[PDB]
Amino acid sequence: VMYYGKGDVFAYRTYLKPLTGVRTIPESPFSGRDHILFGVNVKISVGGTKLLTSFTKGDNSLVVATDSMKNFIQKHLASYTGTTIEGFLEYVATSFLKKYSHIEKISLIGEEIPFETTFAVKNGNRAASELVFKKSRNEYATAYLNMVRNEDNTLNITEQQSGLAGLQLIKVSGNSFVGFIRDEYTTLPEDSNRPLFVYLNIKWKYKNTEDSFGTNPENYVAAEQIRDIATSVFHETETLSIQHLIYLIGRRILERFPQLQEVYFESQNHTWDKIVEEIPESEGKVYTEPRPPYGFQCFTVTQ
Amino acid sequence: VMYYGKGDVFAYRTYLKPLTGVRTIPESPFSGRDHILFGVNVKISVGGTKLLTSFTKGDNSLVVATDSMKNFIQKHLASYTGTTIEGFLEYVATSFLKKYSHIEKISLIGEEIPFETTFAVKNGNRAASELVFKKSRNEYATAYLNMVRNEDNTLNITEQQSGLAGLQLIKVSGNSFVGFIRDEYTTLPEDSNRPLFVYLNIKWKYKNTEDSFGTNPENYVAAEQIRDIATSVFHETETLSIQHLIYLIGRRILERFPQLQEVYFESQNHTWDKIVEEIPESEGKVYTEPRPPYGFQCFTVTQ
Amino acid sequence: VMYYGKGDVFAYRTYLKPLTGVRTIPESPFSGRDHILFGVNVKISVGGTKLLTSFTKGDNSLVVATDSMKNFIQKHLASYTGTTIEGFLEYVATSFLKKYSHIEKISLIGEEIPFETTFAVKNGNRAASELVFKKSRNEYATAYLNMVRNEDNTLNITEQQSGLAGLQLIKVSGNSFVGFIRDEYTTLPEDSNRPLFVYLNIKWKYKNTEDSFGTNPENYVAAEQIRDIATSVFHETETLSIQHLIYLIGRRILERFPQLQEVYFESQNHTWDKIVEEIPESEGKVYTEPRPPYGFQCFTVTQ
Amino acid sequence: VMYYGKGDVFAYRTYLKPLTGVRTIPESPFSGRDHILFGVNVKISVGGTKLLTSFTKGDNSLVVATDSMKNFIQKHLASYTGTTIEGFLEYVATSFLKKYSHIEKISLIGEEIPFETTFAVKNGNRAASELVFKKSRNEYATAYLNMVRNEDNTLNITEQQSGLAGLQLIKVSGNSFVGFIRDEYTTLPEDSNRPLFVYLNIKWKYKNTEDSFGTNPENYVAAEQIRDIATSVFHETETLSIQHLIYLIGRRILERFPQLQEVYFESQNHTWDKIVEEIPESEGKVYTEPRPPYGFQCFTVTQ
Numbered sequence A, B, C, D: 001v002m003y004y005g006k007g008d009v010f011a012y013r014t015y016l017k018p019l020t021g022v023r024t025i026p027e028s029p030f031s032g033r034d035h036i037l038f039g040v041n042v043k044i045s046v047g048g049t050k051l052l053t054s055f056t057k058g059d060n061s062l063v064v065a066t067d068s069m070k071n072f073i074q075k076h077l078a079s080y081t082g083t084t085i086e087g088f089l090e091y092v093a094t095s096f097l098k099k100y101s102h103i104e105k106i107s108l109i110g111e112e113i114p115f116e117t118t119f120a121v122k123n124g125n126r127a128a129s130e131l132v133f134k135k136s137r138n139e140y141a142t143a144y145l146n147m148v149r150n151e152d153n154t155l156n157i158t159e160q161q162s163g164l165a166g167l168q169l170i171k172v173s174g175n176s177f178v179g180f181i182r183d184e185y186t187t188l189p190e191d192s193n194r195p196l197f198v199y200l201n202i203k204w205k206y207k208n209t210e211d212s213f214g215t216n217p218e219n220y221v222a223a224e225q226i227r228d229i230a231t232s233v234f235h236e237t238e239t240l241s242i243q244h245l246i247y248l249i250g251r252r253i254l255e256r257f258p259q260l261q262e263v264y265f266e267s268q269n270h271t272w273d274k275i276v277e278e279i280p281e282s283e284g285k286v287y288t289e290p291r292p293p294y295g296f297q298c299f300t301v302t303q
Ligand SMILES: O=c1[nH]c(=O)c2nn[nH]c2[nH]1
Pocket: A177, A188, A240, A241, A242, A243, A269, A295, D004, D063, D064, D065, D066, D067
């Protein structure tokens, strides 16, 4: 392995071109993005056989300083005329390979820094502010891209993936986990009705890489829509396990977006422990945080 | 100083009595809380001169185990019939002093563990789910209470405070910071138009402690309303400093809630650094994260 | 309340004046600090009636910019000729009040950013490197200082406190917790031999502020020496509770350092849960991490 | 992808069999581990075609509960008679595949939870306590192991890797970074003498998996010895870049440990910003923390 790059390249852009013209789905009212505030955290990795002596001999002649990679990314966010993170990564990658002939491969990760609408009273009525935004530490969109230069100096995207990260959902009832293996290692009781709490990281790949850029937005798959499918399916489903649930979520995603080739899930179980089961004259209970061990699942659904 | 207690007592309650009957204000559509899911993190501190030998001699005869304090809190959330965190703390404090005669003082902190509505398709239409909630890591309500036992075994609340924590707001334009001291220690340029980014912690005290419990909800001051005043005022104001802004927020809060005696602010400046000032044929710019040092302000406004 | 300031002011000085000649105690080898690398995280808060209109009217004419206070601190670290954080704080406080006549009160917190020696083979043998150091995320020394300007234009230190933070100690054997109250809320089983795991924050005050500065190192009390008393006493003691343990640590501290007026403890309990009680052909046991709730104690020993 | 498992499985064993007789190297004093306290954080992932219907149909009949895998790990730590994390992983892997015939693949990650000796005055003199230990949040050893069940029912280790994580090293002098590309994106000034601050994660593979277990300690490569080579080499070297530095560390590692097949580096640059270039009557300088973006390097040296 041989590569280097820059991490935590935060870049905030105002008044990016709005994303509109999206194709709707029943599970989501998502209709586009205003892009008054566009925040991204970018990681960049570059490689190439001509970097060897930078390691083996301390020769920096062909080293793009990582500081300069940060400048490159931030400058390109100012000139970017597109409407998605996926498109932004493509802009950066193509530009970077055309600038630096000795680099054979670039890998980029972009993670949305999300903001939420706030409201203000003005002109006699309360309405959404165009100036004040609330920084969110909840779920966010993600994007991944790998580009390579060939022997004839053409460039090819070799892998692309989009995603939604940091989704934390609890369903208070309508979940079971029964029937699992009961042997000398089992102390977990069967539960007919648990408050399943799951962390979801969902990633998806397109059949055609161009649909990820948003140039023809009707073919774009928004993380917001994926979020809304996941919450809807979790609601609709009498879950039998987290495994059971994410398969059904993946199925719904690929049904809604026939342009997707696959969807990949990384889930974690953070369900609370029960303390009070019976509350007189009430259907409530009390739960508390569990010990640190968490179950997890990794699963791909293919079109 | 001599006291002990328990921290990070997480307790999640389902179907608490809903909060309704709230008095509205122009800045906020807040109309109550469903309380399908009610989450609280509780810290408890207890003291009393009869605890001395537990320290000076290792005599545990009068020590309520901190583990038992956790049990006490969680059990009392199951039996609590009220509608606010402030009321919950009062329930716990009064119960605890009546149980343990040798304790002269209790101090409690409760921090909301907030959840957000999600949506699902069912019965032919998309609607808010009554079962699936999204865990939020953004702002949350808080409450503080101190109770003491007197020589005649009566109990008195000696201090109460409510608050909103974790509010992070950025205003992209309409802020200035000019006119400050320029001497041999000043290298900060004057800025006519900056994207002020502030962290706000806002606490408020009532003129009458009973108005904090929500038993007569019309007198309750909801953290949600405070949130909405802060976002509205930040929007409305051509800010001259963070000091300038939080004074105006405090003023609006005390005008809206004449039952409040004071409001206290802890603010932090996390404004981004400018990278790209001019973008051809566009009013956008690019900013990035600053170095770690942050300015802060602490300020009380009184009625 | 009315004040403002700067936090997370990191400053790293190389080749500070070494601290030498500190009187040793039998529990600790500590005699001084080489100060090849001296790292500190400072928080500064300033107050004054003349700051009012900075809040009420947005008048910045008497606002030292928080950015300037960061410059003030970092420049003063470069010009400090002393040998302790406590003395640095006094240097900064005195210089700042002398510079800015409109300030009536300055409060400073300094936290060491600690580093540890590493091995290097020098003349064919391993030695402590004078060049390479390891950044530690374990315990660190702290200092706190308040200074005011009086009616007659004199300056006076109103409060000074040194400390040790982040000490995490576990004693595998020789700890009991028994004899505590058993009633309807008690589920904690008595334990005659538990692996007590405590977090410790220890703060001490001097009889004479002068001694905090280290100008006469014979009277200086180093955090490193406090660390070593705490670990020796915890080893020596069959603890009966954390309460019992910290009282004994405090007594020893005050015996060794008669110039100290008091020692303050903030302790947390993080003892693991036992999973395996007895292992064949061994004295060993297996434990795991507990649920989040943690006990805590706070207690002051006076000379 | 299809697998599932348990993470953050903390397990603390007292009085594990000591590791003794490890062949020493001149850069490190390390000869073994007392194992009075042996702490590990395990992550387990299992796969198998027979798990499909657990996802597609919600059939739990062939689901080992993740909670049971936690029990499996913690019980096996109690019965492990070996002396290394690498050997523990093999013990667990082999036992788990033998127990559950429907599993085709197990992957294990083990991370040391490190502890450090403390001082106690025993017979009138300070010594390392056999009872009291300090929890460290600095560097720690790691291990990784994949095992499969073949067609003919035999088990085979498909991958094994040991490592060291969380090493943070700063060298105050003797580091340059010069001669890198200067073009329209370059703003980083050349530096002939910088206080290079690097984060290091080092992972190594053995020529013979057998050597990882420590059954014959003469062939075991301890993370502690890797730590000491890294610090010695960093001291010895006038570094020309982090790239240059890690290549040299790798070469030394492989020279000292000829049984190793390769060494892999993941390095980050966290060098401070300089604030004061020259201080009168001293060789010292002042620095502060940089903006968030950090450089990183990844490189593999082979035997
Ligand atoms: O949904 C679940 N899947 C699992 O594999 C599991 N194991 N314990 N609990 C569980 N819940």
